[PDB]
Coordinates of N, CA, C and O and ligand atoms in Angstrom, one line a residue:
Chain A
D1 N -26.4 -49.9 43.6 CA -26.2 -51.0 42.6 C -25.8 -50.5 41.3 O -26.1 -49.4 40.9
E2 N -25.0 -51.4 40.6 CA -24.4 -51.0 39.3 C -25.5 -50.8 38.3 O -25.6 -49.7 37.6
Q3 N -26.4 -51.8 38.1 CA -27.4 -51.7 37.1 C -28.3 -50.5 37.3 O -28.8 -49.9 36.4
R4 N -28.6 -50.1 38.6 CA -29.4 -49.0 38.9 C -28.7 -47.7 38.3 O -29.4 -46.9 37.7
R5 N -27.4 -47.5 38.6 CA -26.7 -46.3 38.1 C -26.7 -46.3 36.6 O -26.9 -45.2 36.0
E6 N -26.6 -47.5 36.0 CA -26.6 -47.5 34.5 C -28.0 -47.1 34.0 O -28.0 -46.4 33.0
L7 N -29.0 -47.5 34.6 CA -30.4 -47.1 34.2 C -30.5 -45.6 34.3 O -31.1 -45.0 33.4
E8 N -30.0 -45.0 35.4 CA -30.1 -43.5 35.5 C -29.4 -42.8 34.4 O -29.8 -41.8 33.9
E9 N -28.2 -43.4 34.0 CA -27.5 -42.8 32.9 C -28.2 -42.9 31.6 O -28.2 -42.0 30.7
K10 N -28.8 -44.1 31.4 CA -29.7 -44.3 30.2 C -30.8 -43.3 30.2 O -31.2 -42.7 29.1
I11 N -31.5 -43.1 31.3 CA -32.6 -42.1 31.4 C -32.1 -40.7 31.1 O -32.8 -40.0 30.4
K12 N -31.0 -40.3 31.7 CA -30.5 -39.0 31.5 C -30.1 -38.7 30.1 O -30.3 -37.6 29.5
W13 N -29.5 -39.7 29.4 CA -29.2 -39.6 28.0 C -30.4 -39.4 27.2 O -30.5 -38.5 26.3
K14 N -31.5 -40.2 27.4 CA -32.7 -40.0 26.7 C -33.3 -38.7 27.0 O -33.9 -38.1 26.1
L15 N -33.2 -38.2 28.2 CA -33.7 -36.8 28.5 C -33.0 -35.8 27.7 O -33.6 -34.9 27.2
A16 N -31.7 -35.9 27.6 CA -30.9 -35.0 26.7 C -31.4 -35.0 25.3 O -31.5 -34.0 24.6
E17 N -31.7 -36.2 24.8 CA -32.2 -36.4 23.4 C -33.5 -35.7 23.3 O -33.8 -35.0 22.3
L18 N -34.4 -35.9 24.3 CA -35.7 -35.3 24.2 C -35.7 -33.8 24.3 O -36.5 -33.2 23.6
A19 N -34.7 -33.3 25.0 CA -34.6 -31.8 25.1 C -34.4 -31.1 23.8 O -34.8 -30.0 23.6
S20 N -33.8 -31.8 22.8 CA -33.5 -31.2 21.5 C -34.7 -31.3 20.6 O -34.7 -30.7 19.5
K21 N -35.8 -32.0 21.0 CA -36.9 -32.2 20.1 C -37.8 -30.9 20.2 O -38.0 -30.3 21.2
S22 N -38.4 -30.6 19.0 CA -39.4 -29.5 19.0 C -40.6 -29.9 19.7 O -40.9 -31.0 20.1
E23 N -41.5 -28.9 20.0 CA -42.7 -29.1 20.7 C -43.6 -30.2 20.1 O -44.1 -31.1 20.7
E24 N -43.7 -30.1 18.7 CA -44.5 -31.1 18.0 C -43.9 -32.4 18.0 O -44.6 -33.4 18.1
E25 N -42.6 -32.5 17.9 CA -41.9 -33.8 18.0 C -42.1 -34.4 19.4 O -42.3 -35.6 19.5
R26 N -42.1 -33.6 20.4 CA -42.3 -34.1 21.7 C -43.7 -34.7 21.9 O -43.9 -35.7 22.5
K27 N -44.7 -34.0 21.3 CA -46.1 -34.5 21.3 C -46.2 -35.9 20.6 O -46.8 -36.8 21.1
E28 N -45.5 -36.0 19.5 CA -45.5 -37.3 18.7 C -44.9 -38.4 19.6 O -45.4 -39.5 19.6
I29 N -43.8 -38.0 20.2 CA -43.1 -39.0 21.1 C -44.0 -39.4 22.2 O -44.1 -40.6 22.6
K30 N -44.6 -38.5 22.9 CA -45.5 -38.8 24.0 C -46.6 -39.7 23.6 O -47.0 -40.6 24.3
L31 N -47.2 -39.4 22.4 CA -48.3 -40.2 21.9 C -47.8 -41.6 21.7 O -48.5 -42.6 22.1
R32 N -46.6 -41.8 21.1 CA -46.1 -43.1 20.9 C -45.9 -43.8 22.2 O -46.2 -45.0 22.4
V33 N -45.3 -43.1 23.2 CA -45.1 -43.7 24.6 C -46.4 -44.2 25.2 O -46.5 -45.3 25.7
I34 N -47.5 -43.4 25.1 CA -48.8 -43.8 25.7 C -49.3 -45.0 25.0 O -49.7 -46.0 25.6
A35 N -49.2 -45.0 23.7 CA -49.7 -46.2 22.9 C -49.0 -47.4 23.3 O -49.5 -48.5 23.5
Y36 N -47.6 -47.3 23.3 CA -46.8 -48.5 23.6 C -47.1 -49.0 25.0 O -47.3 -50.2 25.2
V37 N -47.2 -48.1 26.0 CA -47.5 -48.6 27.4 C -48.9 -49.3 27.4 O -49.0 -50.4 28.1
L38 N -49.9 -48.8 26.7 CA -51.2 -49.4 26.7 C -51.1 -50.8 26.0 O -51.8 -51.8 26.5
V39 N -50.3 -51.0 25.0 CA -50.2 -52.3 24.4 C -49.5 -53.2 25.4 O -50.0 -54.4 25.5
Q40 N -48.5 -52.7 26.1 CA -47.8 -53.5 27.1 C -48.8 -53.9 28.2 O -48.8 -55.1 28.6
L41 N -49.6 -53.0 28.6 CA -50.6 -53.3 29.7 C -51.6 -54.3 29.3 O -52.0 -55.2 30.1
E42 N -52.0 -54.3 28.0 CA -53.0 -55.3 27.5 C -52.3 -56.7 27.5 O -52.8 -57.6 28.1
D43 N -51.2 -56.8 26.8 CA -50.5 -58.1 26.7 C -50.1 -58.6 28.0 O -50.2 -59.9 28.2
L44 N -49.8 -57.8 29.0 CA -49.6 -58.2 30.3 C -50.9 -58.6 31.0 O -50.9 -59.6 31.7
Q45 N -52.0 -57.9 30.8 CA -53.3 -58.2 31.4 C -53.8 -59.6 30.9
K46 N -53.1 -60.2 29.9 CA -53.5 -61.5 29.4 C -52.8 -62.6 30.1 O -53.4 -63.6 30.5
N47 N -51.5 -62.5 30.2 CA -50.7 -63.6 30.9 C -50.8 -63.5 32.5 O -50.6 -64.5 33.2
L48 N -51.1 -62.3 33.0 CA -51.1 -62.1 34.4 C -52.6 -61.9 34.8 O -53.1 -60.7 34.9
Chain B
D1 N -37.5 -56.5 10.5 CA -37.9 -57.7 11.3 C -39.4 -57.8 11.4 O -40.1 -56.8 11.4
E2 N -39.9 -59.0 11.5 CA -41.3 -59.3 11.6 C -41.9 -58.7 12.8 O -42.9 -57.9 12.8
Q3 N -41.4 -59.1 14.0 CA -41.9 -58.6 15.3 C -42.0 -57.1 15.4 O -42.9 -56.5 16.0
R4 N -41.0 -56.5 14.8 CA -40.9 -55.0 14.8 C -42.1 -54.4 14.1 O -42.8 -53.5 14.6
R5 N -42.4 -54.9 12.8 CA -43.5 -54.4 12.1 C -44.8 -54.7 12.8 O -45.7 -53.9 12.8
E6 N -44.9 -55.9 13.5 CA -46.1 -56.2 14.2 C -46.3 -55.2 15.4 O -47.5 -54.8 15.6
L7 N -45.2 -54.8 16.0 CA -45.3 -53.9 17.1 C -45.8 -52.5 16.6 O -46.7 -51.9 17.2
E8 N -45.3 -52.1 15.4 CA -45.8 -50.8 14.9 C -47.3 -50.8 14.6 O -48.0 -49.8 14.8
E9 N -47.8 -52.0 14.1 CA -49.2 -52.1 13.8 C -50.0 -52.1 15.1 O -51.1 -51.5 15.1
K10 N -49.5 -52.7 16.1 CA -50.2 -52.7 17.4 C -50.2 -51.2 18.0 O -51.2 -50.8 18.5
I11 N -49.1 -50.5 17.8 CA -49.1 -49.1 18.3 C -50.0 -48.3 17.4 O -50.7 -47.4 18.0
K12 N -50.0 -48.4 16.1 CA -51.0 -47.6 15.3 C -52.4 -47.9 15.6 O -53.3 -47.0 15.6
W13 N -52.7 -49.2 15.9 CA -54.1 -49.6 16.3 C -54.5 -48.9 17.6 O -55.6 -48.3 17.7
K14 N -53.6 -48.9 18.6 CA -53.8 -48.2 19.8 C -54.0 -46.7 19.6 O -54.8 -46.1 20.3
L15 N -53.2 -46.1 18.8 CA -53.3 -44.7 18.5 C -54.7 -44.4 17.9 O -55.3 -43.4 18.2
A16 N -55.2 -45.3 17.0 CA -56.5 -45.0 16.4 C -57.6 -45.1 17.5 O -58.5 -44.3 17.5
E17 N -57.4 -46.1 18.4 CA -58.3 -46.2 19.6 C -58.3 -44.9 20.4 O -59.3 -44.3 20.8
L18 N -57.1 -44.4 20.7 CA -56.9 -43.2 21.5 C -57.6 -42.0 20.9 O -58.1 -41.1 21.6
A19 N -57.5 -41.9 19.5 CA -58.0 -40.8 18.8 C -59.5 -40.6 19.1 O -60.0 -39.5 19.0
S20 N -60.2 -41.7 19.3 CA -61.7 -41.6 19.5 C -62.0 -41.2 20.9 O -63.2 -40.9 21.2
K21 N -61.1 -41.1 21.8 CA -61.4 -40.8 23.2 C -61.5 -39.3 23.4 O -60.8 -38.5 22.8
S22 N -62.4 -38.9 24.3 CA -62.6 -37.5 24.7 C -61.4 -36.9 25.4 O -60.5 -37.7 25.8
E23 N -61.3 -35.6 25.5 CA -60.2 -35.0 26.2 C -60.1 -35.6 27.6 O -58.9 -35.9 28.1
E24 N -61.2 -35.7 28.3 CA -61.1 -36.2 29.7 C -60.7 -37.6 29.8 O -60.0 -38.1 30.6
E25 N -61.3 -38.4 28.8 CA -60.9 -39.8 28.8 C -59.4 -40.0 28.5 O -58.7 -40.8 29.1
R26 N -58.8 -39.1 27.6 CA -57.4 -39.1 27.4 C -56.6 -38.8 28.6 O -55.5 -39.4 28.9
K27 N -57.1 -37.8 29.4 CA -56.4 -37.5 30.6 C -56.4 -38.7 31.6 O -55.4 -39.0 32.3
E28 N -57.5 -39.4 31.7 CA -57.6 -40.6 32.6 C -56.6 -41.6 32.1 O -56.0 -42.3 32.9
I29 N -56.6 -41.8 30.8 CA -55.7 -42.9 30.3 C -54.2 -42.5 30.5 O -53.4 -43.3 30.9
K30 N -53.9 -41.2 30.3 CA -52.5 -40.8 30.5 C -52.1 -41.0 32.0 O -51.0 -41.4 32.3
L31 N -53.0 -40.7 32.9 CA -52.8 -40.9 34.3 C -52.5 -42.3 34.6 O -51.5 -42.7 35.3
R32 N -53.3 -43.2 34.1 CA -53.1 -44.7 34.3 C -51.8 -45.1 33.7 O -51.1 -45.9 34.4
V33 N -51.4 -44.6 32.5 CA -50.1 -44.9 31.9 C -49.0 -44.5 32.9 O -48.0 -45.3 33.1
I34 N -49.0 -43.3 33.3 CA -48.0 -42.8 34.2 C -47.9 -43.7 35.5 O -46.8 -44.1 35.9
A35 N -49.0 -44.0 36.1 CA -48.9 -44.8 37.3 C -48.4 -46.2 37.0 O -47.6 -46.7 37.8
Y36 N -48.9 -46.8 35.9 CA -48.4 -48.1 35.6 C -46.9 -48.1 35.4 O -46.1 -49.0 35.9
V37 N -46.3 -47.1 34.6 CA -44.9 -47.1 34.4 C -44.1 -47.0 35.7 O -43.1 -47.6 35.9
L38 N -44.6 -46.2 36.6 CA -44.0 -46.0 37.9 C -44.0 -47.2 38.7 O -43.0 -47.6 39.4
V39 N -45.1 -48.0 38.7 CA -45.1 -49.3 39.4 C -44.1 -50.2 38.8 O -43.3 -50.9 39.5
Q40 N -44.0 -50.2 37.4 CA -43.0 -51.0 36.7 C -41.6 -50.6 37.1 O -40.7 -51.5 37.3
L41 N -41.3 -49.3 37.2 CA -40.0 -48.8 37.5 C -39.6 -49.2 38.9 O -38.4 -49.6 39.1
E42 N -40.5 -49.2 39.8 CA -40.2 -49.6 41.2 C -39.9 -51.1 41.2 O -38.8 -51.5 41.7
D43 N -40.8 -52.0 40.8 CA -40.6 -53.4 40.8 C -39.3 -53.8 40.1 O -38.7 -54.7 40.5
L44 N -39.0 -53.1 39.0 CA -37.7 -53.3 38.3 C -36.6 -52.8 39.2 O -35.5 -53.5 39.2
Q45 N -36.7 -51.7 39.8 CA -35.7 -51.1 40.7 C -35.4 -52.0 41.9
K46 N -36.1 -53.1 42.0 CA -35.9 -54.1 43.1 C -35.1 -55.2 42.7 O -34.1 -55.6 43.4
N47 N -35.4 -55.9 41.5 CA -34.6 -57.0 41.0 C -33.4 -56.6 40.3 O -32.4 -57.3 40.2
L48 N -33.3 -55.3 39.8 CA -32.2 -54.8 39.1 C -31.4 -53.8 39.9 O -31.7 -52.6 39.8
Chain C
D1 N -59.2 -62.2 38.0 CA -57.9 -62.8 38.4 C -57.3 -62.1 39.6 O -57.5 -60.9 39.7
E2 N -56.6 -62.8 40.4 CA -55.9 -62.2 41.6 C -54.9 -61.2 41.2 O -54.9 -60.0 41.7
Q3 N -53.9 -61.6 40.4 CA -52.9 -60.7 40.0 C -53.4 -59.4 39.3 O -52.8 -58.3 39.5
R4 N -54.5 -59.5 38.6 CA -55.1 -58.3 38.0 C -55.6 -57.4 39.0 O -55.3 -56.2 39.0
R5 N -56.3 -57.8 40.0 CA -56.8 -57.0 41.1 C -55.6 -56.3 41.9 O -55.7 -55.2 42.2
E6 N -54.6 -57.1 42.1 CA -53.4 -56.6 42.8 C -52.7 -55.5 42.0 O -52.3 -54.5 42.5
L7 N -52.7 -55.6 40.6 CA -52.1 -54.6 39.8 C -53.0 -53.3 39.9 O -52.5 -52.2 40.0
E8 N -54.3 -53.4 39.9 CA -55.2 -52.2 40.0 C -54.9 -51.5 41.4 O -55.0 -50.3 41.4
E9 N -54.7 -52.3 42.4 CA -54.4 -51.7 43.7 C -53.1 -51.0 43.7 O -52.9 -49.9 44.3
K10 N -52.1 -51.6 43.1 CA -50.8 -50.9 42.9 C -50.9 -49.6 42.1 O -50.3 -48.6 42.5
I11 N -51.7 -49.7 41.1 CA -51.9 -48.5 40.3 C -52.7 -47.4 41.1 O -52.3 -46.2 41.0
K12 N -53.7 -47.8 41.8 CA -54.4 -46.8 42.6 C -53.6 -46.2 43.7 O -53.6 -45.0 44.0
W13 N -52.7 -47.0 44.3 CA -51.8 -46.5 45.3 C -50.8 -45.4 44.7 O -50.6 -44.4 45.2
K14 N -50.3 -45.8 43.5 CA -49.4 -44.8 42.8 C -50.1 -43.6 42.4 O -49.6 -42.5 42.5
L15 N -51.4 -43.7 42.0 CA -52.2 -42.5 41.7 C -52.4 -41.6 42.9 O -52.3 -40.4 42.9
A16 N -52.6 -42.2 44.1 CA -52.7 -41.4 45.3 C -51.4 -40.7 45.6 O -51.4 -39.6 46.1
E17 N -50.3 -41.4 45.4 CA -49.0 -40.8 45.6 C -48.8 -39.6 44.7 O -48.4 -38.5 45.1
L18 N -49.2 -39.8 43.4 CA -49.0 -38.7 42.4 C -49.9 -37.5 42.7 O -49.5 -36.4 42.5
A19 N -51.1 -37.8 43.3 CA -52.0 -36.7 43.6 C -51.4 -35.7 44.6 O -51.7 -34.5 44.5
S20 N -50.5 -36.1 45.4 CA -49.9 -35.2 46.4 C -48.7 -34.4 45.8 O -48.2 -33.5 46.5
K21 N -48.3 -34.7 44.6 CA -47.1 -34.0 44.1 C -47.5 -32.7 43.5 O -48.6 -32.5 42.9
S22 N -46.7 -31.7 43.6 CA -46.9 -30.4 43.0 C -46.9 -30.4 41.5 O -46.5 -31.4 40.9
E23 N -47.3 -29.4 40.9 CA -47.4 -29.4 39.4 C -46.0 -29.6 38.8 O -45.9 -30.4 37.8
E24 N -45.0 -29.0 39.4 CA -43.7 -29.1 38.8 C -43.1 -30.5 39.1 O -42.4 -31.1 38.3
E25 N -43.4 -31.1 40.3 CA -43.0 -32.5 40.6 C -43.6 -33.4 39.6 O -43.0 -34.4 39.1
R26 N -44.9 -33.2 39.2 CA -45.6 -34.0 38.3 C -45.0 -34.0 36.9 O -44.8 -35.0 36.2
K27 N -44.5 -32.8 36.5 CA -43.8 -32.6 35.2 C -42.5 -33.4 35.2 O -42.2 -34.1 34.3
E28 N -41.8 -33.3 36.3 CA -40.5 -34.1 36.4 C -40.8 -35.6 36.4 O -40.0 -36.3 35.7
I29 N -41.8 -36.0 37.0 CA -42.2 -37.4 37.0 C -42.6 -37.9 35.6 O -42.2 -38.9 35.1
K30 N -43.4 -37.1 34.9 CA -43.8 -37.5 33.6 C -42.6 -37.5 32.6 O -42.5 -38.4 31.8
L31 N -41.7 -36.6 32.8 CA -40.5 -36.6 32.0 C -39.7 -37.9 32.2 O -39.3 -38.6 31.2
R32 N -39.6 -38.3 33.4 CA -38.9 -39.5 33.8 C -39.6 -40.7 33.2 O -38.9 -41.6 32.6
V33 N -40.9 -40.7 33.3 CA -41.7 -41.8 32.7 C -41.5 -41.9 31.2 O -41.2 -43.0 30.6
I34 N -41.6 -40.8 30.5 CA -41.3 -40.8 29.0 C -40.0 -41.3 28.7 O -39.8 -42.2 27.8
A35 N -38.9 -40.8 29.4 CA -37.6 -41.3 29.1 C -37.4 -42.8 29.3 O -36.8 -43.5 28.5
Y36 N -37.9 -43.3 30.5 CA -37.8 -44.7 30.8 C -38.5 -45.5 29.7 O -38.0 -46.6 29.3
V37 N -39.7 -45.2 29.3 CA -40.4 -46.0 28.3 C -39.6 -46.0 27.0 O -39.5 -47.1 26.4
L38 N -39.0 -44.9 26.6 CA -38.2 -44.9 25.4 C -37.0 -45.8 25.5 O -36.6 -46.4 24.5
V39 N -36.4 -45.8 26.6 CA -35.2 -46.7 26.8 C -35.7 -48.1 26.7 O -35.1 -48.9 26.0
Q40 N -36.9 -48.4 27.3 CA -37.4 -49.8 27.3 C -37.8 -50.1 25.8 O -37.5 -51.2 25.4
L41 N -38.3 -49.2 25.1 CA -38.7 -49.4 23.7 C -37.5 -49.7 22.8 O -37.5 -50.6 22.0
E42 N -36.4 -49.0 23.1 CA -35.1 -49.3 22.3 C -34.6 -50.6 22.7 O -34.4 -51.5 21.8
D43 N -34.3 -50.9 23.9 CA -33.8 -52.2 24.3 C -34.7 -53.4 23.8 O -34.1 -54.4 23.5
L44 N -36.0 -53.2 23.8 CA -36.9 -54.2 23.3 C -36.7 -54.2 21.7 O -36.7 -55.3 21.2
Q45 N -36.6 -53.1 21.1 CA -36.4 -53.0 19.6 C -35.2 -53.7 19.2
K46 N -34.3 -54.1 20.1 CA -33.1 -54.8 19.8 C -33.2 -56.4 19.8 O -32.8 -57.0 18.9
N47 N -33.8 -56.9 20.9 CA -34.1 -58.3 21.0 C -35.3 -58.8 20.2 O -35.3 -60.0 19.8
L48 N -36.2 -57.9 19.9 CA -37.4 -58.3 19.2 C -37.4 -57.7 17.8 O -37.9 -56.6 17.6
Ligands
LIG101 NA1 -33.0 -28.4 19.0
LIG102 NA1 -65.1 -40.0 19.2
LIG103 NA1 -49.7 -32.1 48.6

């Protein structure tokens, strides 16, 4: 599927961006990711 | 944007909550986050 | 709620799948998860 391939390219681009980040920057990013997913899980746990 | 600032406040609140969790609780939370994102990625990989 | 219980079962199934993965496979999966969430955060940071 087209959209599937586009998503993989978006993911690979983000991985290349992440590769340039320092160890501490990566930890800050991972923390942000965890917090965002948890906010998403809560707001979803409300309507679903 | 308003919604953007609101999201950052939601993320900061979640970060403050995470900061109070023990190391083992944090590992349990990260595991849950990983599993949830993968479920989301699959269900999305179906409609998209 | 029904959908809530279904989500927990989906998450537990994914956790069981993750448990079978090697340490290196788990790192690859976590990297993919981080990149996907960041793509999601960007595309959301555009419409919201
Ligand atoms: Na660099
Ligand atoms: Na504490
Ligand atoms: Na195994």
